[PDB]
Design a protein around this ligand. Structure first.
Ligand SMILES: Nc1nc2c(ncn2[C@@H]2O[C@H](COP(=O)(O)OP(=O)(O)NP(=O)(O)O)[C@@H](O)[C@H]2O)c(=O)[nH]1
Ligand SMILES: [Ca+2]
Ligand SMILES: [Ca+2]
Ligand SMILES: [Mg+2]
Ligand SMILES: [Mg+2]
Ligand SMILES: [Mg+2]
Length: 166
C-alpha cells in the first residue's frame, strides 16, 4: 500500500508531539518532555485509500536537534507547526521552511502551516497573519488543538492531500 512519510517540525514546545500523539494514540499529552527524534506508524484510510502514515516527530529544542537534517531528508511532506500564543514560534517558521528546502534540495516541497493551541485565548498570532504567510508559500494554513482534537486529523490529512498534488 502507499506509504506517506510525514515530518513534523517547529519550535520547541509548540505541540508537535501532542499533535502526533493525539492523531495516532487518541489522547492528549499534558506534560512537556522534549523530543529527540521519534517515529510513529499507523495504517489509515484517507479519502478511500488505505495507506500507511510514517510520521517523524522532530526536536524543536536546539539542544536536542543534533542530526535533525538527516532525519528530515526522506520526508515527503512537512507539517510546519507554530503555536498561536507564541509569536517567536511563528517568526521561526520561515527558517524551518528554509531548512526543509535545504534538505530536500527543492523549492517545491509538500507542506502545511499549522497554528496549534487554538484552544488557548492568549493569542498573539492572528489567523490572517498566518494565512498570509501560508499564501506566500503556496500552502494551506490550518489551526489545531492537540488538547481538544480540533483540526488534528484535518492537518495531517491535508498534508497527505498536498503530497498527492505533487
Ligand atoms: N492548551 C494546549 N496545550 C498544548 C497543545 N499542544 C501542546 N500543548 C502543551 O504544550 C507543551 C509542549 O507540547 P509538546 O507536544 O511536548 O511540544 P513539542 O513541540 O513536541 N516540543 P519539543 O520540540 O521540545 O519536542 C505540553 O505541556 C503540551 O501539553 C494544545 O493544542 N493546547
Ligand atoms: Ca493526558
Ligand atoms: Ca541539501
Ligand atoms: Mg511514499
Ligand atoms: Mg516533541
Ligand atoms: Mg499583533
Amino acid at each position: 500500500m502507499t506509504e506517506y512519510k510525514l515530518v513534523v517540525v517547529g519550535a520547541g514546545g509548540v505541540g508537535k508531539s501532542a499533535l502526533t500523539i493525539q492523531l495516532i494514540q487518541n489522547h492528549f499529552v499534558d506534560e512537556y518532555d522534549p523530543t529527540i527524534e521519534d517515529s510513529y506508524r499507523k495504517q489509515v484510510v484517507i479519502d478511500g485509500e488505505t495507506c500507511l502514515l510514517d510520521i517523524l516527530d522532530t526536536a524543536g529544542q536546539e539542544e536536542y536537534s543534533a542530526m535533525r537534517d538527516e532525519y528530515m531528508r526522506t520526508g515527503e511532506g512537512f507539517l510546519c507547526v507554530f503555536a498561536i500564543n507564541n509569536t517567536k514560534s511563528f517568526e521561526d517558521i520561515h527558517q524551518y521552511r528554509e531548512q526543509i528546502k535545504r534538505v530536500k534540495d527543492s523549492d517545491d516541497v509538500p507542506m502545511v502551516l499549522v497554528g496549534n493551541k487554538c484552544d488557548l485565548a492568549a493569542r498573539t498570532v492572528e489567523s490572517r497573519q498566518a494565512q498570509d504567510l501560508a499564501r506566500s508559500y503556496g500552502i494551506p494554513y490550518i489551526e489545531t488543538s492537540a488538547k481538544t482534537r480540533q483540526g488534528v486529523e484535518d492537518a495531517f490529512y491535508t498534508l497527505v492531500r498536498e503530497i498527492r498534488q505533487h
